[PDB]
Amino acid sequence: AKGTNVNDKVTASDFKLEKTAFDPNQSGNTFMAANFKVTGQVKSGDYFTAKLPDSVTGNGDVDYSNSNNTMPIADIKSTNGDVVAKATYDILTKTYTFVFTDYVNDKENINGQFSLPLFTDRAKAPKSGTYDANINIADEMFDNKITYNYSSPIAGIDKPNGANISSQIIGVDTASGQNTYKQTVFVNPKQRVLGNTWVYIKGYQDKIEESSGKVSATDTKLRIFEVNDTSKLSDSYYADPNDSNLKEVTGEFKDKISYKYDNVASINFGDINKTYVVLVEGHYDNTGKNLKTQVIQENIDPATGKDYSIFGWNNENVVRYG
Amino acid sequence: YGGGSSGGGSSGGG
Ligand SMILES: [Mg+2]
């Protein structure tokens, strides 16, 4: 159910952001907290909402797209554990909706409170910086600013011919049961001159038995895009496959990708001199083991045939609650 | 040789 929108009966207050600056590339995030109050009375079905600007999201790197873009949210209660309201959040509209239950039918001057995780929006806010973060609760605007200090994905050896590669897991499907994940790898973020270049996507880090991840030809799809202008790349790891700045070249790799070795995939980039982006759609198992991963690149050559090198990179994500 | 990054998100209480 869900009847009336009682925003006008509702007035939030005591709003604070746990903190106003963080690095979302090291599991940075914050929380919005607040008290609310119901001038008057209501009934099962009424509801109020909260809405988030472009800058933040309410699900961060947990994907819900395979769940009708709907994020369950732990119930709102009284002290006897009585479920006062049921809550959820729409990934698309960035709308929290709290819908009362069989509890409100006999009370007035109602008071509750929430605390809700807030994460960056990697598409909306793709470059380190300060953004307007005006949050709406029950038609009242609460204004803030968020600074994102992304750990530059431009990372690798300090050598002119040094292997350099980074990557992030930017969406994980915990809810649907499909157990999918989305990961952006950047190969040659430094856009150096690189010889016989090799890449590896692992479903684990040092220990297989320590990660749920699974990387096989059957569990894993890969799309590769030559970048036009590296500077135009996101600090956030988001990559829009439809950016003109990216040219999908997945068709140049039919015979350069191997799922031979366990929980790994290898691409043969060859002789390259600019950045490439790899979209990973993969899956992890029901082991409950955390999803940990690592990508590595090595290059030989270039114009010497010696001074070979290698650089690696690790991912895992963290879960918060509201 | 290597580095790293980690991410974060909400399970939705579940
Ligand atoms: Mg394999």
Residue numbers in the entry:
A (entry chain A): 210 to 531
B (entry chain Q): 8 to 21
Excerpt from the publication:
ClfB, an MSCRAMM (Microbial Surface Components Recognizing Adhesive Matrix Molecules) family surface protein, described as a fibrinogen-binding clumping factor, is a key determinant of S. aureus nasal colonization, but the molecular basis for ClfB-ligand recognition remains unknown. ClfB plays a key role in establishing human nasal colonization by binding to the human type I cytokeratin 10 (CK10) expressed on squamous epithelial cells. As a bifunctional MSCRAMM, ClfB also binds to fibrinogen α (Fg α), which is assumed to be significant in platelet activation and aggregation and has been shown to contribute to the pathogenesis of experimental endocarditis in rats. In this study, we solved the crystal structures of apo-ClfB and its complexes with fibrinogen α (Fg α) and cytokeratin 10 (CK10) peptides.
